Copies of this chain bind each other. A is one copy, B any other.
Amino acid sequence: FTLIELAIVIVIIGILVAIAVPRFVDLTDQANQANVDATAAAVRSAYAIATVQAKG
């Protein structure tokens, strides 16, 4: 590579770095809560259906 091409590369690397980038976040607490809540809704419906099947 010519020295000019390396100079251009040295410039552009410095500009394509110094972007923002997202953090990874452990969102499993929020997702676990929604899983527990959705499951609780399912248990209530499953119970209601069971009261008809059981006739009691």
Contact = CB atoms under 8 A, between A and B. Distances in A.
A36 interface: no
Contact of A51 (B4, B14, B49): B4
A27 interface: no
Copies of this chain: 2
Chain A interface helix/strand/loop/mixed: helix
A4 B56 CA distance: 10
A54 B15 CA distance: 15
Size bracket, chain A contacts: 10 to 19
B48 A10 contact: no
Given A2-B48, A3-B51, A10-B52, 10 more contacts: A3-B45, A3-B48, A4-B51, A6-B52, A7-B48, A7-B52, A10-B55, A11-B55, A11-B56, A14-B55
